[model samples]
Target: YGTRTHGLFKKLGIPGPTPLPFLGNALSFRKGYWTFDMECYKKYGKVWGIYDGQQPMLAITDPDMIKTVLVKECYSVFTNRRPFGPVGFMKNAISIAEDEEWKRIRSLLSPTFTSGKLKEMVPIIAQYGDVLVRNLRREAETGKPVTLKHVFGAYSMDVITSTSFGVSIDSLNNPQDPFVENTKKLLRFNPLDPFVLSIKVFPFLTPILEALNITVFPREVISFLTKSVKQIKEGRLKETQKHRVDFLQLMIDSQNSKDSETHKALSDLELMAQSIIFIFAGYETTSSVLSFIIYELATHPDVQQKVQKEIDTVLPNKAPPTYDTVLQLEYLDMVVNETLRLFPVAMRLERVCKKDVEINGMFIPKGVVVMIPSYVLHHDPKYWTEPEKFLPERFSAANADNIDPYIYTPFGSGPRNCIGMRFALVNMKLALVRVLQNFSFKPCKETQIPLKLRFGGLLLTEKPIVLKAESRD
Candidate 1:
């Protein structure tokens, strides 16, 4: 299996550093932990090959190849995301399921996050944004150095709690909420640890690890979610209280609409699983994006000022940012695009080829893992001019139009793209707008520029950015 796979990788016309037995090129990834893949991209060109034991994987940085994987062959290549060891209530969500199951879950959940649905969520999004701004304003009054990362994480947790689970968690007010704490623990994956590293490298052992309950997701989180889903279901049927228009309501409705006994409304377990996954997906990624945006704005005062100008011009009356006003701030959108370009929250997009496929005169064998390193692609010198520079204008219509569509994916592209893209973006935009409207961010001496991303952890950040927020009159 190892030799055949390696030969197939060679035939695919990709290059990479030497592989080592069961570890393959994983040693390099093991070395840096945080920016290892990125460092490799600087050495190898756009496309490179790696192996996990006998399993061949290609790390693709080419835009056209990425497009093919994400768009043209989305079904074949991205039929399922690589399974992490089962986390009790997170096992069956749309992210991990394959083929028909993925289709069903995705279809059922898509409408809940549509642009129109997300627009309806504007008030809720703005409410959380306002809370965040107020918290920051209070911090600024005391001359406290704002830890934007923590604040953003809190804001995101609040938004997802409100929108996804129909629970109002004021993380901005009470950052140590039990749910928030649990969620944080869930994301704290330690890649360098021997056990954690073993789990990731060996898929078969995932179930065994899960059975041992040594997974990334905590048991308490699963319990809380399960209890919440049961309460929601019981509450909806018994009480005449008007239901909230959130993702939970949509899921309940979808559940009820199912007629078949076998394919009926999700069990409490399934509901808990799906709900937790939704919240994680919605909360973590969007919050990380906001944190990065704040860091960028803090470092690039010119960019920050330009975005603030747009916000001021668009909402001169100091009105809460409306859906229409949010759409009107083109410069704000550019800032967001630029932030995503530099620090894509998802970082890498993965797929496993379902069938043998040929592209650019190379053959990708069936079941081979195809990895699209968004960070590498975004920073590729061939596609992006001065790729390291923070230039929002690159996202302007003229520049964006000139660029290849495949290369600029903050969210993945094509039909299987992020269902919550609109929801996530609107939340980030409104949150930034409200915060920027009230204050200006200045990088403090404590600020970590050219950020050193946390080692052996998910979510990209250079360091904890300390910014002084000066209140505007």
Candidate 2:
């Protein structure tokens, strides 16, 4: 089959790395796919193809082409994510669900992250941001190198727990909590793992694997989250207004307030899938953002000071910064935007052709995978001047207007872009404002000289960030 795929791109006039027998191009990138894709773009320009086993994938970095597929226009033909097949109960997950399930669930869950809903979550984030600051102060006194990622993870975990489940989590003191421990592994996931390979290349094997109870989430993690979410819903079945910032309540209300027939109310397992993704999607990516932000704050003294000046003006009180006030810090927003451009959590955006289709001069058959190079596009000198430099002003309102929309989408673009973007942005803004309000970060002897990004996992660092946290006073 792979031998057949060797000629696949020749037929399409697409360029890609050579495929080996059976394995295809999937395993060729055990480590350097991102770099390899950059090299491919350097050679073949914007459009190309690659293979995963016998499956052919089209790779494009053209912004208009990206908009066509990702936005509302071609959405019907490419409605679903790359199929993971029937991976047992995992298929019910919002991140992997297809067609009707995606539409229904997305419609129901959309309100959970509306601006009004996120505005309501601000004080909750501020309340927890104080806790995070308190946690950081203790770490500051340790006077030893700290795992900035671990500390930020714990803080983000606390925020997600409080907002999502209406549960209080002291991630700092209770380090051994199962939710914290199991979730610690989230950032450590490797794309080359066996389970990921099966889901990606051999979707047909998923049901058989599921029959053997093979799963992505550990069996115990699934059990823990499932029972906990079920208990919460059951106890709250008669009540929905009890909590103002409850993510679970928002989801439950979706089921309760709407007609069960047309709404197709979320089942308990489905609810668990959404909740876990809420937790995963909520904390993991934001924590990664904060880690790099902190590292940048330490390394880029000028950018840090500029952001601190903005933070000082916007959040000038012990009363806590409100959602509106946080949004007012435009420069800080620029810093976050620039960092995300340089290091987005998800490495690349990929989609599978639901049916045979063509774009540009290329012909795409059904079952073909499509990809856009996020890192490469973000770093391309064509769109960005001095792409390697840390220049937040590049995203300033004045400059950003001239930039293409598809090039700067850190959370992704279009209707199917991250639904939780409001929540993630608010949490990030709250964390940065609150931390800067009390302290300033400085590079220490333990800090890395020049940041090195690791390749195996999503939004990872080659070394843990080590910085000294000093009180601003």
Candidate 3:
């Protein structure tokens, strides 16, 4: 590793503590930003500098600055994100690809998450919800304490697999299924793995870190997903295409398009990585969001009552919610919006500046990576009334416009935000509708008061969220 220096920190006139040699402040950013980032912001004010060896990265809590970098004028220079580890199969993965590859692949997949396409997935989402509702009913009837994470985790696992692969799965009932196993494997992925640290600490080594046995994803996990995609592709080749439904099905059809210019087909490894990305991206995030939303409803029965009232008014007789049905529930929308504001699974939005440019009066130089701290922005007292409290009405249609667009980013905004935002929202709405219609979550003796949060890339609970549920009837 080279010398650790904050030369640009001085250049940009940013304030931060002196960083350690060859480690920068990377050592400080451990599990999530709970201990590290917030502490830095508190110390340095809104913007401050940190380093990964010699590289200068800034932590910005000021929403206007973030909007400038991530949205408003996010021109060509800021389109890509910084690399975390060795780029092998991951290079082809959309999460970190650059320039034309990113543009081509993203354009190809954009149609998959359109409002109409997501509506087609409503049935697939609702199919496994039967298992969730039925099983929860049994648990509720038995009067047993339940952990919400595992329950919702399985709920999302089922939805993503069924919709993405066109395969039926019930991880809630059968955790041993091949598809479920992939979800389990991906849950163990760590961004702070040695290779990730090495590359960040020694930026140039990112290109060849794999030669020294460095990998962001483990070999076994990679093997299963890549193998699965290969087998699936061969199987798909034999089966005649239909109306271009399903996530993988759409991509496969596009890959086999008549245009040779777009043969830009993903290799089996790249394809599998995309599948894995969707699984991890789709599973825990939606589940976690639903879990928190339900927990909020449990704690605030008034909000839950409002949601149920909305559902009853629209559907009448325990009807399964479709895309259109869920979208019509304005109160339900506020509840979901407020819930996401409080417990966003994704904590930060990032980008690497390719050219020096002035944003919000600060001259950000080329090659510096910048981060938008979403959690901090969400809870800022300046933007939210009773910032720490759970109030769904804050996002009501009447007054929500008062808040700045950059201030509330449950799914980060702008063109490069989450690619599956609509897809996630639709599935989450479906799951919430399934459980809320028939059951009521209520606090039990085991319920963790002052919800304990775990630190990681994803915002999670340190202790299990134990609660009791009963049949509403």
Clashing pairs in 3: 32-456
Could you give candidate 2's per-residue lDDT for residues 1-473 as a string of tens digits?
Answer: 33765687887777778887767786656555567678878988878888877778788887878888788544577676665444456576677778877887787787777899888767767777878788888888787666787678888888886567656677888868766665555424444567777666655676687788776666676677667667766777567557756787677767666644667777767777777777767777888999888887778888899988877776666447888887798998889988888887777787778887777555777877778778888899999888888888888889857778787767777777888887788788888887877777888887888987666546677788888888876
Rank all candidate structures by their TM-score, best first, as comma-separated numbers: 2, 3, 1
Residue 367 in model 2: lDDT: 75
- TM-score, candidate 1, is 0.90
**Per-residue lDDT of 190-279 in model 3, one digit per residue for the tens?**
675665677677777755666775667766767776666677767766775545467877666666554446547655555655666787
Local error of candidate 1 at residue 424 (angstroms): 0.8
In candidate 1, which residue pairs clash?
451-462, 452-462
Number of clashes recorded per candidate: 2, 0, 1
TM-scores vs. true structure, each candidate = 0.90, 0.93, 0.92
Q: How many backbone clashes does candidate 3 have?
A: 1
Most accurate candidate by lDDT: 3
Quote model 2's TM-score.
0.93
